[PDB]
Amino acid sequence: ITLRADRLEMIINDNVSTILAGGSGTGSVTLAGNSSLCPISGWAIYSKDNGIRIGSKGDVFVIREPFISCSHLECRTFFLTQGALLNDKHSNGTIKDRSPYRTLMSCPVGEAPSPYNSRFESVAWSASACHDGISWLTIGISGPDNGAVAVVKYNGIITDTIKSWRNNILRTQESECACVNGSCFTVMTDGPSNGQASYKIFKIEKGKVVKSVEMNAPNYHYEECSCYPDAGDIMCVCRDNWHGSNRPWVSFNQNLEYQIGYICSGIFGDNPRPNDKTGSCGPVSSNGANGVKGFSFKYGNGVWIGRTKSISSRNGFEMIWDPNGWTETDSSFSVKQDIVGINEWSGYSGSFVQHPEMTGLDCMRPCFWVELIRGRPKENTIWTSGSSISFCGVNSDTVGWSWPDGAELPFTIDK
Amino acid sequence: ITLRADRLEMIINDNVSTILAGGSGTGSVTLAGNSSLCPISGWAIYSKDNGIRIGSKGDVFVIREPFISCSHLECRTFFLTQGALLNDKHSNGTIKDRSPYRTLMSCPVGEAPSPYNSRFESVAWSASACHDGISWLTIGISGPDNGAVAVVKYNGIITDTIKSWRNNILRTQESECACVNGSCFTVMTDGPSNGQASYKIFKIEKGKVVKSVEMNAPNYHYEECSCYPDAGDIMCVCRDNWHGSNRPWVSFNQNLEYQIGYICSGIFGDNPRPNDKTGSCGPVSSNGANGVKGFSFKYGNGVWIGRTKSISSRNGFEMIWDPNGWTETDSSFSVKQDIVGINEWSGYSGSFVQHPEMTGLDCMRPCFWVELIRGRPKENTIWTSGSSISFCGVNSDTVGWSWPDGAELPFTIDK
Amino acid sequence: ITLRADRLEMIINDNVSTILAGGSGTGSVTLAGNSSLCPISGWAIYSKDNGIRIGSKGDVFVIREPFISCSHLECRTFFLTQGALLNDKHSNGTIKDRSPYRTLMSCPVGEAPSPYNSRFESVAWSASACHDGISWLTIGISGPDNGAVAVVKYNGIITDTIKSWRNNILRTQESECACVNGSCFTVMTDGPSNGQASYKIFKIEKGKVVKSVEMNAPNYHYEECSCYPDAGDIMCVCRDNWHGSNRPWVSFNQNLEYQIGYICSGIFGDNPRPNDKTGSCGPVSSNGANGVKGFSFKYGNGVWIGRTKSISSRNGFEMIWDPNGWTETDSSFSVKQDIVGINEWSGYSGSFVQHPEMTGLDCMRPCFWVELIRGRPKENTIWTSGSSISFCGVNSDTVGWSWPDGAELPFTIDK
Amino acid sequence: ITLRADRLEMIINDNVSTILAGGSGTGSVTLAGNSSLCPISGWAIYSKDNGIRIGSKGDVFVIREPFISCSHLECRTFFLTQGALLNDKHSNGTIKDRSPYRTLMSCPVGEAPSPYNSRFESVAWSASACHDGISWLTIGISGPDNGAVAVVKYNGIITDTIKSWRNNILRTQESECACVNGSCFTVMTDGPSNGQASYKIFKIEKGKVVKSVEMNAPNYHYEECSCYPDAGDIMCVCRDNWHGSNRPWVSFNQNLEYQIGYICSGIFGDNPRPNDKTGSCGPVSSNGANGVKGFSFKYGNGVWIGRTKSISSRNGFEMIWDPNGWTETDSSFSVKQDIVGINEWSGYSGSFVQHPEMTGLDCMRPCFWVELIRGRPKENTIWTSGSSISFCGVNSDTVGWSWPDGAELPFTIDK
Ligand SMILES: *[C@@H]1O[C@H](CO)[C@@H](O[C@@H]2O[C@H](CO)[C@@H](O)[C@H](O)[C@H]2NC(C)=O)[C@H](O)[C@H]1NC(C)=O
Ligand SMILES: *[C@@H]1O[C@H](CO)[C@@H](O[C@@H]2O[C@H](CO)[C@@H](O)[C@H](O)[C@H]2NC(C)=O)[C@H](O)[C@H]1NC(C)=O
Ligand SMILES: *[C@@H]1O[C@H](CO)[C@@H](O[C@@H]2O[C@H](CO)[C@@H](O)[C@H](O)[C@H]2NC(C)=O)[C@H](O)[C@H]1NC(C)=O
Ligand SMILES: *[C@@H]1O[C@H](CO)[C@@H](O[C@@H]2O[C@H](CO)[C@@H](O)[C@H](O)[C@H]2NC(C)=O)[C@H](O)[C@H]1NC(C)=O
Ligand SMILES: *[C@@H]1O[C@H](CO)[C@@H](O)[C@H](O)[C@H]1NC(C)=O
Ligand SMILES: *[C@@H]1O[C@H](CO)[C@@H](O)[C@H](O)[C@H]1NC(C)=O
Ligand SMILES: *[C@@H]1O[C@H](CO)[C@@H](O)[C@H](O)[C@H]1NC(C)=O
Ligand SMILES: *[C@@H]1O[C@H](CO)[C@@H](O)[C@H](O)[C@H]1NC(C)=O
Ligand SMILES: *[C@@H]1O[C@H](CO)[C@@H](O)[C@H](O)[C@H]1NC(C)=O
Ligand SMILES: *[C@@H]1O[C@H](CO)[C@@H](O)[C@H](O)[C@H]1NC(C)=O
Ligand SMILES: *[C@@H]1O[C@H](CO)[C@@H](O)[C@H](O)[C@H]1NC(C)=O
Ligand SMILES: *[C@@H]1O[C@H](CO)[C@@H](O)[C@H](O)[C@H]1NC(C)=O
Ligand SMILES: [Ca+2]
Ligand SMILES: [Ca+2]
Ligand SMILES: [Ca+2]
Ligand SMILES: [Ca+2]
Ligand SMILES: [Ca+2]
Ligand SMILES: [Ca+2]
Ligand SMILES: [Ca+2]
Ligand SMILES: [Ca+2]
């Protein structure tokens, strides 16, 4: 009697505290992160926000990198803004990219990013964010180029900082971090963008850096990593801004033991890039300098590559299933799904996942977002912004099309 | 002791999980859907949003098909928008109806549809949505005309897709689906809009298509079905765009065994249409081509018909109780309730219900919404939008009137 | 053992259902309404919304009658709008007062009334609203002058209708109804505004009219009643638009047994009115025609009168404690507290209460709101709107001042 | 059996009531307030709202004193506004500071302060606010200069008033009050701003003044106190507007037994001020008249001073760790962290804390906000507003920089 009566008092007191936290929005169980990526045959459109069309009249932030990340209850678009609205003089893009005005904010997926529906996350000109099942982890880097500091928040509260260890533009994913069993993982770079730099993997629990490792990656270059969990490890597919037209990757376990390489497919994933031809398992130097944030999903030895359609500018977007492309160098693939037509503006892209705790599936669902960049330098405006579209992978019927930005430039402020 | 103590631990753990889901908004019990339609004598006004009057100044979407659907806790207006606001250059209506910019969004009933109060649902140029007691089911069709794909979401998460089986503009209700005991039901059409096409009924559980049936309906034409539950079966009243001035219907049980016919009343329900005269239990071909989304409620052999007042254009609206009109061909009715005056713009209309789990009644409450279309082609604007009004059926005193849109066109953007 | 174990299963199942309803916002316990009005010495300012100043630039409704009512968790401003925004052509006030565009909406107390923060309540050109401890009761009258219908909603769902019984502008409080022990009470009038009319008291439970009584009030005239609970009965202080410069009152118990009279004080409470002099316990006919919505609080034989400062137009506002003014005819009072200066625009005013279930007090707290009317006919604008201020009664130190509207007219739209 | 079964019924009934209150947002446990300030080495940026840049186009209040205060679930920016928006004629700053239009409002930290995201708190031209673990305490002073009244609200409900006891501009912190174990503490001043005035400490529980003490502080002057809890006592660092270029402080226990003094450091904290030189433990009269709201944190005999960089106007901002500066008069310090560059506009600043109940730390976290004042009198606009930045103290790596306002003045309304 005393055992069962004391057992009920703990269950009530515990569950009540859980219920009170869940009212404020905090979850009760961490995401396991141990399932493998879902079998899929194609991509179904998930969101489009029409941000720039709406901001022609509405009160909408000029934004960059609208990356998506999901809790176990909702999916949000995170983004960076200079704290200026479309069609206002402050959106003038002469301001440096790494400015003290730059902030990380977020809004529900598919909504135009407005001061009236957007939540403040961090002061940031480079950022990452992800949810561990319990609270949002946000990482916002600000400060001078020679001593930037990433401010780490868990549930909106500052929990750690990470300072530049090379004094040369500390910078991170610009898409979601990856969470497995209560630890979240990101990659940061410090150093040249046109030469060998330094790359670190961070393991973060409740917003505290609990472990970091510097990658030994001579002749590799890592920027703006798209990282996802897969079977309890983390895979990141990144941008080589130094001398790679194919993408670098790094994978690691929860102890930060890692492996590195480049995607071998002759279907080169970066922009700019050469025309497809025999590829390489190291960096493809032809047109390899500069780049664009991107992603890929590894399935065995095959790979789903998302990439621009143009080899030379950020135009079009397509998904390509290359069944041996992770490890083999040919430029043959078996499935292409159009996402944005060749003549249409595209831009950054990144992975995001939906965990089984949210979907009810027994596998890790892969998704991706694309940023559709409008304005300077390609168009005669004073401003630059992106809108977004996103897709999730499904094992059912899908279709290719073109879902472009659709705004008519210039705007009023440009005259 | 061990039985009652273990019985309390399951009740606590179960109810706590329920409470945590209900905090995120998810319900605990599916709608039964087995009650019969309430006895009613007339229609009481429920909402009016004044969307276009407000959007003359406010930041309000240009929208079409503002259909209502209710959970067990709230009623929402779903709608399609091109991602443009009233009084902005992007609202120019040259853009094709089936564009990649078109999205399904929703806002609380009676509020102007704004980016600041509207929730994103799906990328969609044809849509359906309904709530099963637990979560929102949304269906959003996008893609090319020759291979459109309906993306099915349950609680905002992609759960299924349905691809065009005739390659000729897959398209669905543009009003709510119907839910009974945890299964939700919709109708889709693929094929010509001016000839025989193909019509399928879908049964969907937790967002998964669990059964579908192709209707064998030679010489019938089904579009834009208004479907409601009634006594555990589903009734749909639709639009014959081929050769019917009266409306087609299809009814089915939870196993998708169905019946078909046309509303026999000589009070023809479509627009355009002939003047009332002896009707037919098959398609009335006179002025039968083209049409307008509409609805009717069957009560025994009688029918409540909502229809435009004009026989030739989308003007006025009225409710007509025809006590033998479901099965008989005369053009005599017994009650008319004015909704929108003959000289006033109207448009699409559709049914929605309020379930006993929400109302506390012992019957299924019938309601309807009307879209009040302003702008092109009837008026000299660059844009087209609808505002909405809605009514619920009551068995108490009511009154007819005219509740029209009320905006003064043209707007500023039109000059 | 079986008794205590079955007793715990009912408590858990019951409280869980309560918790799930409270998540959606519904309360668990009805307001008792049996306490007497708090002892007070003066009025402390509670809110000011600056609606019209903000709407000079912001997207703010043109509104009338911003009356306040409170649940056990929040206080809201209800208001009527034509569905037009300040500084837009649709705010042109030629439109009839009783139009099909008129709607009852509400927003948090002190916020400018905007489509982006306002909740839709009802289609209405006359309205009442109040909260019984569990859900919002709203009453919205719309329809033609000769057959208007009040639509009654409880928790946003239509529960009853009340149709005009004299075919001559059915109309009600334009401030909150009064709730006692789960029954809510309002007063409606049907008939002439310049002559004897008909007045009914309604008792409403869960949105259902359960009892009504026609008042036998020869030579009295009742409009726009301000009703509050006091010691388990209801007191209403109203507007005599026929031939009374002092205000009529009606009080009743939960069985609708009522008493009637006029406030005897020579401190006349209506506008227009004569200068103070010996008053009357019946209607004071001098300047008695026309009127303004107002209120008073009865304390024994004394009365707190809120009134304009001008005898001839809606300017200024003051609170006056007349310790024998309920029953005596002299024009001497003992305390005046300024609210709006004599040269400043005022307008409608009404009572609202805060119940002990919300305040924790052992008494009924009295409060009032004032509408500050700007624009037509007194000013050269095309529009008319009100902003609001409100005050609660306290038994601690207070101060008089002038808290006026503060907008600078005309606006841009007026030129 | 009867003991354990009755013990479970109380736990369920109690916790359920707690859960229902927590749904409305009310907390269950008061903040202890007994921990000491966290060890820190520097300041990490927490928020920036870019209010004025956004309000160039958006609908954003003209505001002053954007002070932050946190519950156990969120942090908010409180602020005063005249009820006018940026870029509208009503923002013209001729209106007196202490106007009847002035209101205390609040919005989530880092969001531009807009009518669409801001909650109304109080009518106020001087204010304080803080959260005791259970509900928000707000204090809003309005009224005439010769009889102002602070209206005290707890959980949005009026609970007390405090009237001016010297009839000479009653006025308070303009930053958060301090809460310890369910009692909240603030300081108010009544009297001259250029001479000896009167200073009172108030202890407030559930919004009721339970104790007050007049400070005996001859030759001291206290205004706009920044108060924080530290080890179960309260420390306030204030502004001497009479004859002090260093800041006054007052500390007290829960029984309002207090001590007073001035910060001795020759690193003078007020603005205007002399160049640093040997300081004083009493008021430094040189340039001591006038002032700016500010703060400091005491650590043993050392002090963290936040101050403008300019000695003569409100420009720049810096944090200075002076390890003996609380009690010693030298002008040597050991750490400076830049916050706003010398040529950039700054303004008011204040402390706020994050309690262990919110952070999970075992110490009191110190934070501060800075207001970045733009417009009149220093710039050729008709209006004056502030934006804000904030920082929290951390014991990890940080960096100095300049995070200024960034708006380009004049605005459209100024021409
Ligand atoms: C956008 O910003 C740029 C950079 O501030 C502006 O060009 C500057 O204009 C100022 C004064 O107008 C000149 O003194 C500077 O020399 C210009 N800067 C450079 C780098 O050339 C430009 O005018 C802005 N455009 C608009 C439309 O606001
Ligand atoms: C609305 O859109 C139509 C279609 O895009 C516009 O008409 C086009 O205008 C362009 C350039 O102005 C011409 O080159 C095209 O030939 C026109 N198209 C057609 C189909 O005639 C129209 O100008 C737009 N109207 C407004 C007010 O923006
Ligand atoms: C406000 O509304 C009134 C009434 O509709 C307008 O006056 C009408 O104007 C129309 C055309 O402008 C005339 O044909 C009518 O005869 C006028 N009506 C009356 C009753 O005189 C008025 O112009 C509107 N004002 C503004 C600024 O929009
Ligand atoms: C800002 O407000 C001031 C003060 O109200 C305005 O100056 C006043 O203007 C009125 C009429 O324009 C004159 O009669 C007063 O004499 C002026 N007051 C003072 C104190 O000189 C000023 O015009 C306003 N500015 C703008 C741009 O609205
Ligand atoms: C439930 O209530 C009891 C007192 O009746 C209290 O001691 C206990 O802490 C509460 N539990 C929680 C989780 O708040
Ligand atoms: C993943 O982890 C969860 C929870 O820790 C466990 O129940 C599940 O069986 C694991 N699955 C696999 C495939 O390892
Ligand atoms: C309630 O708390 C206990 C631990 O005290 C835990 O095992 C159980 O899972 C909780 N129940 C729920 C539904 O979270
Ligand atoms: C409808 O179903 C519910 C729940 O399954 C049941 O309790 C109820 O009696 C049914 N009513 C009818 C009329 O079949
Ligand atoms: C609690 O859970 C049990 C099943 O474990 C269920 O029968 C019961 O209805 C639930 N109670 C409520 C109020 O939902
Ligand atoms: C009022 O009613 C409540 C609840 O019904 C009761 O507890 C209370 O004692 C009553 N008070 C008076 C003064 O009648
Ligand atoms: C829980 O429910 C019981 C009745 O089943 C009721 O008496 C009790 O007051 C409820 N508890 C709370 C905290 O509402
Ligand atoms: C502070 O108070 C809390 C709660 O009253 C107590 O548990 C804790 O031990 C106290 N800490 C110190 C340092 O006094
Ligand atoms: Ca590259
Ligand atoms: Ca290949
Ligand atoms: Ca037809
Ligand atoms: Ca008939
Ligand atoms: Ca009168
Ligand atoms: Ca008297
Ligand atoms: Ca000073
Ligand atoms: Ca020193």
Numbering used by the authors:
A (entry chain A), B (entry chain A), C (entry chain A), D (entry chain A): 55 to 469
Paper text:
N1/09 hybrid means residues of loops 01 and 23 of N1/2009 grafted to mSN1 (H5N1/2021) scaffold. Twelve dissimilar residues within Loops 01 and 23 of N1/09 were transferred to mSN1 scaffold to form N1/09 hybrid. The N1/09 hybrid showed an 8°C improvement in its melting temperature Tm to 64.4°C compared to the N1/09 protein (56.4°C), while the Tm of the N1/19 hybrid (72.4°C) surpassed the H5N1 mSN1 scaffold donor (68.7°C). In contrast, CD6 bound strongly to the N1/09 hybrid protein, which had a higher Tm of 64.4°C. CD6 also bound strongly to mSN1 scaffold donor. Seven mAbs which did not bind the mSN1 protein but bound N1/09, also bound to the N1/09 hybrid protein, showing their specificity for the transferred loops. To assess whether loop grafting influenced the local or overall structure of the NA, we determined high resolution crystal structures of mSN1, the N1/09 hybrid, and the N1/19 hybrid. Overlay analysis revealed that N1/09 hybrid and N1/19 hybrid were nearly identical in structure to mSN1, with overall RMSDs of <0.25 Å across equivalent Cα atoms upon overlay. In contrast, the N1/09 and N1/19 hybrids show no noticeable differences between the protomer cavities, all of which closely resemble the wider msN1(ii) conformation, apart from minor, local widening of the rim induced by the substitution of Y344 with an asparagine residue (shown as light-green sticks). Additionally, we observed that the Y344N substitution in the N1/09 and N1/19 hybrids slightly widened the enzymatic cavity compared to msN1. However, N1/09 protein did not induce a cross-reactive response against mSN1, although the N1/09 hybrid did elicit antibodies that inhibited mSN1.
